[PDB]
Amino acid sequence: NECLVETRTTRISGRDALCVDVAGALTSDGSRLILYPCGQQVNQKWTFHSDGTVRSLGKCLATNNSKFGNLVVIYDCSKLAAEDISWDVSVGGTIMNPNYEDLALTSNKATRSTNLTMEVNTYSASQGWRVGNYVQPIIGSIVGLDDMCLEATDGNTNMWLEECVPNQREQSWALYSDGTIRVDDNRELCVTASSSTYDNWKVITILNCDGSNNQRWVFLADGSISTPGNQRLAMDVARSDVDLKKIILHRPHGDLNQQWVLFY
Template identity: 30%
Template sequence: MIYNCTGNAYAVDATKWKKWDNGTIISPRSSLVLSATSGNMGIEITLQENVYATSQAWAVSNNTEAIVTPIMNKDQFDMCLEAINYISKIGYIGCQSGEMRQMFALYPDGSIRLNGNRDDCLTTDHKSNMVAVALCNGGVEQRWSFNRDNTISNLNSGLVMEARNNYLYLYPSSLPRGSQEWQAWFF
């Protein structure tokens, strides 16, 4: 519910919010963030601890459409991410113009979805550090940040995507940040 926050009934600092660059809206007073959860009656907005989930990402915009694009290596323009036969692995292979498995939908909530099936999201597998494909669930393992240094990081773990042995994994960023050619991406 939205309340009229005028008068003496509310502490002034309880009505102030901050929006971070990554889309998180936080109450400085409580350190809780706005979170949207789906239910039978629609979407419920609550305050929760910040875990960097996609359900905690917000955009100040009327545009909720995804950007559809291949994700290419910054230093090797002919190498792209690809959903391998729409199974759980994300590969790193030569770019092919118009290849549907190499087209990703980048959403304002920080999720990266397969354009051919937008119910599937790039997901971290914490056991193997592999980036995989799984049903979108709004969780922390599916929220990504496109950083100024051309790395793509999982906001929860802070690890960045890195291509190794033709697959995509999560690793600590190399120093200086993003200097490792296998960690730099563009779209």
């Protein structure tokens, strides 16, 4: 037991709980990587090294606009430039190269076998990743003020606080590796920040999961349910008043109406 960890072999799961997969287990320099259903396959095993590289099949994950354009690929650590194979993982689920600051690891589609790319970082739910060996959605209740539970109301189209009822289906949420919070009874449906407003703040509702930057959330150590990246906002119970039936997206202040607990 030691506070320096040298290398670690784990998995990376992203959009729609799918995994980062080196396409058809290919070993060649320039073999491209795709989103694919998670399994124990060697090409879904990713090893992180203290040098900052992230590797499968003994080769390094890499991005270079001159050589590969927009596409993310595995390539030899000896051959490639040290700039192009170094990586950073953030608590909010962003995987990115420190040299290519505007860009972030992306899956432009939710479907399997889709080539992974380095797009412009909008902190979108298609740019959200969980590094870790447990890839499954984490299912629980989400508890706010007055020990009340978030409930999916109006045929899974709105969201607000109700008195907790154990094993009520509409009070169960599934937290996915992409940072989406999804209706347990319908996994095509995401907690989303709407265009509709209350007191000039976006109201939170349930819409179809579309991989936007309105449907990516991170549970932080401060007890907030927040948007990733800068210009951060938090989920909050409007006016600390459960009777308003309105959850809105507010500037973070860490008060009770912005505090939540995952009851798993």
